[PDB]
Design a protein around this motif. Structure first.
Motif, PDB file in Angstrom:
ATOM      1  N   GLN A  17      37.680  46.789  46.931  1.00 17.14           N
ATOM      2  CA  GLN A  17      37.449  46.936  48.353  1.00 17.14           C
ATOM      3  C   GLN A  17      37.927  45.769  49.200  1.00 17.14           C
ATOM      4  O   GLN A  17      38.682  45.954  50.172  1.00 17.14           O
ATOM      5  N   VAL A  18      37.467  44.553  48.870  1.00 14.38           N
ATOM      6  CA  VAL A  18      37.787  43.383  49.713  1.00 14.38           C
ATOM      7  C   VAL A  18      39.291  43.027  49.733  1.00 14.38           C
ATOM      8  O   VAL A  18      39.815  42.592  50.772  1.00 14.38           O
ATOM      9  N   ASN A  19      39.971  43.191  48.593  1.00 10.39           N
ATOM     10  CA  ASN A  19      41.409  42.963  48.512  1.00 10.39           C
ATOM     11  C   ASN A  19      42.219  44.085  49.130  1.00 10.39           C
ATOM     12  O   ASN A  19      43.327  43.855  49.628  1.00 10.39           O
ATOM     13  N   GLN A  20      41.653  45.281  49.136  1.00 10.42           N
ATOM     14  CA  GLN A  20      42.305  46.402  49.774  1.00 10.42           C
ATOM     15  C   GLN A  20      42.237  46.234  51.299  1.00 10.42           C
ATOM     16  O   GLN A  20      43.212  46.499  51.984  1.00 10.42           O
ATOM     17  N   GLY A  24      40.868  48.345  30.595  1.00 10.84           N
ATOM     18  CA  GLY A  24      41.234  48.972  31.838  1.00 10.84           C
ATOM     19  C   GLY A  24      41.707  47.978  32.870  1.00 10.84           C
ATOM     20  O   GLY A  24      41.329  46.802  32.844  1.00 10.84           O
ATOM     21  N   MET A  25      42.535  48.468  33.787  1.00 16.33           N
ATOM     22  CA  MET A  25      43.047  47.675  34.894  1.00 16.33           C
ATOM     23  C   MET A  25      41.969  47.660  35.978  1.00 16.33           C
ATOM     24  O   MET A  25      42.011  48.391  36.985  1.00 16.33           O
ATOM     25  N   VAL A  26      40.957  46.837  35.743  1.00 17.49           N
ATOM     26  CA  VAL A  26      39.738  46.852  36.556  1.00 17.49           C
ATOM     27  C   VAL A  26      39.800  45.942  37.758  1.00 17.49           C
ATOM     28  O   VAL A  26      38.867  45.914  38.558  1.00 17.49           O
ATOM     29  N   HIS A  27      40.880  45.193  37.895  1.00 15.49           N
ATOM     30  CA  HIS A  27      40.991  44.223  38.963  1.00 15.49           C
ATOM     31  C   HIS A  27      42.177  44.524  39.902  1.00 15.49           C
ATOM     32  O   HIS A  27      43.279  44.785  39.455  1.00 15.49           O
ATOM     33  N   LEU A  28      41.911  44.465  41.201  1.00 13.70           N
ATOM     34  CA  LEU A  28      42.948  44.512  42.224  1.00 13.70           C
ATOM     35  C   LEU A  28      43.151  43.119  42.827  1.00 13.70           C
ATOM     36  O   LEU A  28      42.183  42.470  43.265  1.00 13.70           O
ATOM     37  N   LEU A  29      44.395  42.666  42.827  1.00 13.49           N
ATOM     38  CA  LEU A  29      44.774  41.394  43.459  1.00 13.49           C
ATOM     39  C   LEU A  29      46.051  41.605  44.254  1.00 13.49           C
ATOM     40  O   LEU A  29      46.667  42.651  44.142  1.00 13.49           O
ATOM     41  N   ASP A  77      43.935  36.523  46.288  1.00 13.96           N
ATOM     42  CA  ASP A  77      42.819  37.291  45.744  1.00 13.96           C
ATOM     43  C   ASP A  77      41.558  36.778  46.440  1.00 13.96           C
ATOM     44  O   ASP A  77      41.158  35.616  46.244  1.00 13.96           O
ATOM     45  N   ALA A  78      40.970  37.632  47.265  1.00 16.59           N
ATOM     46  CA  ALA A  78      39.751  37.335  47.999  1.00 16.59           C
ATOM     47  C   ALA A  78      38.530  37.940  47.311  1.00 16.59           C
ATOM     48  O   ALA A  78      37.446  37.969  47.897  1.00 16.59           O
ATOM     49  N   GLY A  79      38.695  38.403  46.056  1.00 12.61           N
ATOM     50  CA  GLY A  79      37.623  39.158  45.360  1.00 12.61           C
ATOM     51  C   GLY A  79      37.443  38.857  43.891  1.00 12.61           C
ATOM     52  O   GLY A  79      37.086  39.755  43.135  1.00 12.61           O
ATOM     53  N   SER A  80      37.644  37.588  43.496  1.00 10.00           N
ATOM     54  CA  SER A  80      37.500  37.144  42.078  1.00 10.00           C
ATOM     55  C   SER A  80      36.027  36.933  41.698  1.00 10.00           C
ATOM     56  O   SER A  80      35.648  37.068  40.524  1.00 10.00           O
TER      57      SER A  80
END
Ligand SMILES: CC(C)(COP(=O)(O)OP(=O)(O)OC[C@H]1O[C@@H](n2cnc3c(N)ncnc32)[C@H](O)[C@@H]1OP(=O)(O)O)[C@@H](O)C(=O)NCCC(=O)NCCS
Length: 290
Positions: A70-73, A104-109, A122-125
């Motif tokens: 969410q936050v990176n999107q 799984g590709m569980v992280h969005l950056l 990346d604002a969501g680590s």
């Protein structure tokens, strides 16, 4: 306009017109200091939606935070809107309890490109794994920041984000060995590739992270927020504040166990979170560290 609403929510004054590293850095800093990493909807019977419009309303209009997807999107949308060349990338999170990366590709950056130069954004680590400035995509280069030294390394076409953390001084004798504390100075954060993604590439994992019995988000209520000197993190009933580089290249960490009644007040005053339904905080099993 939506973009002005977003900038108001993060306290950023877009007065300089320029699409440069200083501007990118200022926006990243503002977001991570305003928009908490949080999964509290999962603990008060509310949705973890992947739709940008729903995320915008939740974060910008209702002053909530979210997890990486969410936050990176949201940050992707803001940076794209103002004209930065921005790409979504997918990562696989390190899992310290089993010494492996996620299947799984569980992280969005994000990757932001400025006149050919590449920055990982990346604002969501989460908690003390959170970068304060963008990292240049240069394998083997030390990138010291206030939180820690970040390291990007490439091996076999895969990119790895690691950090080297300071020693930790714990001010509450009762938490000296808390399972909330990162154990090692050298910590793997995640791995990723430079293949461009769309948000639909994360739809299956958005569901997985809400439903799989392996998901730490189901059994752990978690929120974190950066400050100009440190990190607040609430994991279940345990509130922590970390001051980076307190003295002698050591971090200072405070811990307090909250009552159920105190959680609501802490959420309001520290995180600027107000929930519309009853929260059931959950301690977790040490899977999500501060
Ligand atoms: C990522 C996560 C969902 C696990 O992902 P996954 O794709 O299910 O992981 P894997 O399939 O590789 O699981 C590996 C094994 O370790 C186990 N495992 C996973 N997480 C574990 C944990 N926290 N503690 C102990 N064991 C764990 C699983 O049971 C699994 O067992 P199996 O091999 O018998 O099936 C979970 O570790 C998690 O919730 N991580 C948090 C990620 C995060 O902090 N993201 C922040 C940005 S949003």
């Amino acid at each position: 306009s939506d973009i002005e609403a977003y900038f108001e929510r993060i306290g950023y004054k877009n007065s300089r017109n320029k699409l440069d590293l200083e501007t990118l850095t200022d926006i990243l800093e503002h977001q991570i200091r305003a928009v908490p990493f949080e999964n509290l909807n999962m603990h008060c019977g509310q949705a973890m939606e992947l739709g940008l419009e729903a995320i915008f309303d939740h974060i910008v209009r209702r002053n909530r935070g979210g997890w990486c997807l969410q936050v990176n999107q949201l940050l992707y949308w803001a940076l794209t809107t103002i004209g930065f060349q921005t790409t979504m990338l997918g990562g696989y999170f390190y899992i310290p309890p089993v010494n492996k990366y996620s299947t799984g590709m569980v992280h969005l950056l994000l990757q932001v490109t400025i006149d050919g130069r590449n920055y990982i954004v990346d604002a969501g680590s989460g908690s003390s794994s959170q970068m304060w400035q963008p990292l240049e995509l240069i394998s083997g280069k030390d990138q010291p920041q206030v939180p820690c030294i970040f390291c990007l390394t490439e091996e076999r076409g895969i990119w790895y984000l690691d950090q080297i953390r300071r020693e930790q001084y714990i001010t509450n004798k009762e938490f000296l060995n808390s399972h909330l504390l990162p154990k090692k100075k050298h910590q793997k954060i995640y791995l990723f590739t430079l293949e461009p993604r769309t948000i639909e590439d994360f739809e299956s994992m958005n569901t997985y992270l809400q439903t799989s019995p392996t998901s730490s988000f189901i059994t752990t209520s978690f929120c974190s927020l950066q400050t100009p000197e440190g990190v607040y993190c609430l994991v279940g009933f345990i509130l922590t504040y970390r001051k980076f580089n307190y003295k002698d290249n050591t971090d200072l960490v405070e811990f307090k166990t909250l009552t159920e009644e105190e959680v609501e007040e802490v959420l309001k005053n520290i995180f600027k979170i107000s929930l519309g339904r009853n929260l059931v905080p959950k301690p977790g099993d040490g899977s999500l560290t501060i």
